[PDB]
Design a protein around this ligand. Structure first.
Ligand SMILES: O=P(O)(O)C(O)(Cc1cccnc1)P(=O)(O)O
Ligand SMILES: O=P(O)(O)C(O)(Cc1cccnc1)P(=O)(O)O
Ligand SMILES: [Mg+2]
Ligand SMILES: [Mg+2]
Ligand SMILES: [Mg+2]
Ligand SMILES: [Mg+2]
Ligand SMILES: [Mg+2]
Ligand SMILES: [Mg+2]
Lengths: 357, 355
């Protein structure tokens, strides 16, 4: 049922958006068709965990069936706002990361009939749609300003995180727009401290915090929860989520992952890289440095081999157990004053812990 | 300019100070973003920003309230300037441009990667929302302001889609297929050109500064919005026509940017007007040489535009526009004399501009 209602609201959203373009933007049928395909390709096909979380949180906290109908419809719209914001980030990210596939299909910019220049702008259209749907459904809601204030702040935080992500292989000391420099050679910025910052801002806020907050807002329950503990939870689960993403990038097969990994080739400051460099022997580190950040098949294979030799999967399972311990504690802390909200956080945790995605 | 530039400092201080305090940002990246902001937002003529101030001030015609409206207008002005900065960073990447305002394009700076530049463009747009909330959280006009600002942002992105898909047979548009640059150039019609330019340029360059000025001076309902939109679309079309002409005919030292329309096979005013008027042999030579980075092919296309006396047609198009602008400003002046005076000034910043 939650999935059923979520998909029905997608239809309403898509119909509103596409029918407007025809009538208000002088758009021809061919370009309306193009944008319908863009929307469908970029926003559908994932698990909708962010979207579905908003619904779960909203319904969990409202406790007269008219108000339930309304809150649930508002939660569906908020959920699609987050899914569209994500779709926006993934279109741009794939171009930025030179990725090949996503969800088992070509990246948007890699479709045979999409130009990179169009794809950049298509990503922008996706973000605009979040604002368009918000105004269409919420123009008369008293929570609109607070909703969008928070939504926009998380959008901002994500872009700040993406900056951390894309500048992480560069000695930050040598960062100057008017100069230029190659990939790091000592990898001295590949610290856990730096990793934690990247991951908090690029992923945790929009993936974990935002769904929770929007759910709280449409159920008009925000002030009822300890926001400090909630944020702690969100950051911890979001860090772990990105750690899983990084591990899967190297170790999960494309048929199950849906995407071809690029972290090695792009010289990303991944969890694998930072953890490997902190533990690996001198010879291992030297071979890593000589092979990392190259598209060369065998250099990538060398790095994959080194990660395998360093038993990084091992370290992950241990990181995983420590995270799970802290999650339980914080959920129990939240349950003290907000048992309903804590139950929804537990479900979000259940969708995350040991995910095979 | 003086108060506009001091509001910039205030905006920049708020934004950069936050990043340190709230985003755990290191001094190096704060420095990087300060330079990014300065390079992308400063150096133009601030005509949209300055228009917001002119409109707001002219529609209050209390000293404390004047101070307030003017400060609000400056913030709105910078919102539009930052939104523009955002569009120009992405557009330069999309259009494979080399230079802007006599400097390298942002993505062409030696220490900027293209992947960083894309994201920098996004940061610029985010800043428009951040400044709005910092300054206007308590203003009753906030929802209406942002509603319209966001709609114009949207319209611009729709316009950019028109721009970027204009050399492709629209019948043959399918994400799952692929197709080269047009061979017959049958879509290079004046009808299609007018749609591109209305949406990519006219709304954010002409309509938005007017609307934002009306809003902060609390004067929006006082004006005929139909006639106002008419003016905005007409002046915006003409503005983009000037842009297209300058792309080919204005020297880089004066223009501040290297032209790319020919190489990118754009549906420019030059292209559409040329193809409508040129001889069979000229048309054929155009089709054989357009949309190529080849130095000799670009020179051929430039030569053909010169031979076709497009400069001539421009002067005639310009006179026709000026006639209709005068008509509409006089219509506006009937009920909104003060607003009409501000529109006339905006028109004066546009007509026969050498930029
Ligand atoms: O799905 P991807 O590309 O593996 C990723 O998670 C996508 C993404 C984009 C933006 C913010 N957070 C994650 P990345 O971080 O690039 O590894
Ligand atoms: O400044 P430019 O690049 O000549 C231009 O005017 C920039 C621009 C960007 C976005 C919307 N409108 C104009 P373009 O349209 O690409 O010719
Ligand atoms: Mg990626
Ligand atoms: Mg990425
Ligand atoms: Mg990844
Ligand atoms: Mg351009
Ligand atoms: Mg352009
Ligand atoms: Mg141009």
């Amino acid at each position: 049922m939650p999935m059923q209602m979520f998909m029905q609201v997608y239809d309403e959203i898509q119909m509103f958006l596409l029918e407007e373009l025809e009538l208000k933007f002088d758009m021809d049928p061919n370009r309306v068709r193009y944008l319908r395909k863009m929307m469908d390709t970029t926003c559908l096909g994932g698990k909708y965990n962010r979207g579905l979380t908003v619904i779960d949180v909203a319904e969990s906290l409202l406790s007269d069936g008219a108000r339930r109908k309304r809150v649930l419809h508002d939660a569906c719209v908020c959920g699609w706002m987050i899914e569209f914001l994500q779709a926006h980030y993934l279109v741009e990210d794939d171009i930025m990361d030179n990725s090949v596939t996503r969800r088992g299909k070509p990246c948007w910019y890699r479709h045979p009939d999409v130009t990179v220049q169009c794809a950049i702008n298509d990503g922008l259209l996706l973000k605009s749609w979040t604002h368009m749907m918000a105004m269409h459904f919420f123009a008369d809601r008293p929570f609109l300003q607070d909703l969008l204030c928070r939504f926009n702040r998380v959008d901002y935080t994500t872009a700040v995180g993406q900056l951390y992500d894309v500048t992480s292989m560069f000695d930050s000391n040598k960062l100057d727009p008017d100069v230029s420099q190659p990939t790091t050679t000592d990898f001295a910025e590949f610290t856990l401290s730096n990793y934690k910052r990247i991951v908090k801002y690029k992923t945790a806020y929009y993936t974990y915090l935002l769904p929770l907050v929007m759910g709280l807002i449409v159920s008009e329950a925000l002030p009822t929860v300890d926001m400090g503990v909630t944020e702690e939870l969100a950051m911890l689960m979001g860090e772990y989520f990105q750690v899983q993403d990084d591990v899967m990038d190297c170790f999960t097969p494309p048929e199950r992952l849906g995407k071809v990994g690029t972290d090695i080739q792009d010289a990303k400051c991944s969890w694998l890289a930072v953890t490997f460099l902190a533990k690996a022997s001198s010879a291992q580190v030297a071979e890593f440095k000589a092979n990392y950040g190259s598209g060369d098949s065998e250099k990538v294979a060398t790095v994959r081999r080194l990660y395998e030799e360093a038993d990084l999967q091992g370290d992950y399972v241990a990181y995983e157990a420590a995270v799970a311990e802290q999650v339980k504690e914080l959920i129990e802390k939240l349950r003290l004053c907000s048992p309903g909200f804590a139950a929804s956080v537990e479900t979000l945790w259940g969708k995350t812990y040991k995910r095979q995605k």
